[PDB]
């Protein structure tokens, strides 16, 4: 259970949106087009298969 902690970033989501392998971008609670306009205290990433 690898929980990557994300803090002190400038999260540009355009690189993630234009990333070659990953396609689906489902979101709950926030709007994806607004995702470059907000500030989060901490982000946590879980990358599984």
């Amino acid at each position: 259970w690898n929980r990557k902690r994300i803090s002190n970033c400038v999260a540009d989501y355009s690189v993630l949106y234009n990333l070659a392998p990953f396609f689906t971008f489902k979101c709950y609670g926030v709007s994806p087009t607004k995702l470059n306009d907000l500030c989060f205290t901490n982000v946590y990433a879980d990358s599984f298969v």
Binding site: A20, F22, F23, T24
Partner: protein, 50 residues
């Protein structure tokens, strides 16, 4: 990949206006009945009246 493969996209921009319409779906026109309480349908505008 599937999200990076090209997709042909067709956008139809419909015009819903109170002007006399030129494009319509397949439907026939019946006789015009006056001075009686009937149901009517003028170019998609439905109603019931005299």
């Amino acid at each position: 990949g599937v999200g990076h493969q090209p997709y042909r996209v067709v956008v139809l921009s419909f015009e819903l206006l109170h002007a006399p319409a030129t494009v319509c779906g397949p439907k026939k026109s019946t006789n015009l009945v006056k001075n009686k309480c009937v149901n009517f349908n003028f170019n998609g505008l439905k109603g019931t009246g005299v």
